[PDB]
Scaffold this active site. Structure first.
Site, PDB file in Angstrom:
ATOM      1  N   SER A   1       6.803   5.159  -5.230  1.00 27.80           N
ATOM      2  CA  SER A   1       7.623   4.843  -6.382  1.00 27.80           C
ATOM      3  C   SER A   1       7.307   5.807  -7.520  1.00 27.80           C
ATOM      4  O   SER A   1       6.182   6.276  -7.658  1.00 27.80           O
ATOM      5  CB  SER A   1       7.353   3.399  -6.808  1.00 27.80           C
TER       6      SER A   1
ATOM      7  N   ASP B   1       9.163  -8.850   9.891  1.00 29.50           N
ATOM      8  CA  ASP B   1       8.032  -8.318   9.148  1.00 29.50           C
ATOM      9  C   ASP B   1       7.987  -6.793   9.257  1.00 29.50           C
ATOM     10  O   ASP B   1       7.488  -6.257  10.258  1.00 29.50           O
ATOM     11  CB  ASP B   1       6.744  -8.928   9.707  1.00 29.50           C
TER      12      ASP B   1
END
Length: 330
Positions: free
Chosen positions: A199, A35
């Site tokens: 992004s 994770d």
């Protein structure tokens, strides 16, 4: 040193991935969920409330000659999906794919929430976010990666998750045969303890690319891709019959649909998520309503590049003094 381990989807939907981890002496092998959105290595154990164990493999520290109780230490964690676990702490030897850390904090669960009990395939979590998020008290502990770093050939790990197929976690090296083209690196902020990056935009299907900054985290522990409501609405508007369902808890679509791809930007580069990666199947057995793999992050407070996004790429988690993230197509 280096390590290399295969990671395997737990079910036919790629809801999560498990990677075998050797703990203790002699080794006890447990299948852990790696994770990158949390920083605790915790396991089902001989200390876990019996009624809360249902098919998982447990760690038994009393059977490990290298286990030592970390006196006075406790831990307690609550995850984004509402699940939780807590317990006490041992240090022991932990190996992943041939890479060994001595003195790793292994957090032994005394209690786990129902969603963990109900998933027989996950024996615990191995956190790979920054150690500042680790929940051990009163002395915070380091992640497996943080402990291994100095010994690694290069201070990196990579995630190469498969679509409906096994993939690989590598530590300490970049497998140049595992991706196509070049790796594009992008800046990381560690201020919230995550692999947080921005992004450069998105496209839906064969549509034009929209340049827009989307701040989010690279999180192997989250199944889906969670993005701003505007982006998500633009995606699902291209699927006939798709709608947001408050009763189901997100966007659903007719199982008869062919889904468009979704592209996200990494600097000037582009990662394409095929439409099939966005199909999470019937909302309930036999239903013709299917759950979408792109969902709104509104009210999470952060955008999440989860497995849906990451499995479309070869991803470098660069833990150099100034961390960065790299993405390549594959």
């Amino acid at each position: 040193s280096t390590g290399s381990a295969t990671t395997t989807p737990i079910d036919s939907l790629d809801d999560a991935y498990i990677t075998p981890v050797q703990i203790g002496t002699p080794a006890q092998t447990l299948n852990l969920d790696f994770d990158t959105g949390s920083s605790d290595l915790w396991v089902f154990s001989s200390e876990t409330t019996a009624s809360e164990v249902d098919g998982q493999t447990i760690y038994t520290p009393s059977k490990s000659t290298t286990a030592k109780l970390l006196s006075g230490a406790t831990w307690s964690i609550s995850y984004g999906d509402g699940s939780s676990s807590s317990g006490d702490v041992y240090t022991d030897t932990v190996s992943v794919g041939g890479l060994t850390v001595t003195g790793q904090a292994v957090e032994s669960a005394k209690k786990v929430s129902s969603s963990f009990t109900e998933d027989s395939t996950i024996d615990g979590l191995l956190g790979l976010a920054f150690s500042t998020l680790n929940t051990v008290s009163p002395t915070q502990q380091k992640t497996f990666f943080d402990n291994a770093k100095a010994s690694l050939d290069s201070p990196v790990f990579t995630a190469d998750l498969g679509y409906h197929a096994p993939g690989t976690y590598n530590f300490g090296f970049i497998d140049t045969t595992a991706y196509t083209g070049s790796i594009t690196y992008t800046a990381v902020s560690t201020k919230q303890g995550f692999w947080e990056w921005t992004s450069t935009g998105y496209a839906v299907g064969s549509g034009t690319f929209k340049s827009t900054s989307i701040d989010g985290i690279a999180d192997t522990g989250t199944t889906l891709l969670y993005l701003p409501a505007t982006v998500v609405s633009a995606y699902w508007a291209q699927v006939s019959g798709a709608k947001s369902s408050s009763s189901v808890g997100g966007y659903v679509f007719p199982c008869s649909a062919t889904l468009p791809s979704f592209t996200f930007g990494v600097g000037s580069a582009r990662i394409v998520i095929p439409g099939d990666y966005i199909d999470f199947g019937p909302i309930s057995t036999g239903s013709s309503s299917c759950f979408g793999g792109i969902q709104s992050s509104a009210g999470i407070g952060i955008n999440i590049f989860g497995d849906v996004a990451l499995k479309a790429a070869f991803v470098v988690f660069n833990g150099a003094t100034t961390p960065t993230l790299g993405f390549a197509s594959k």
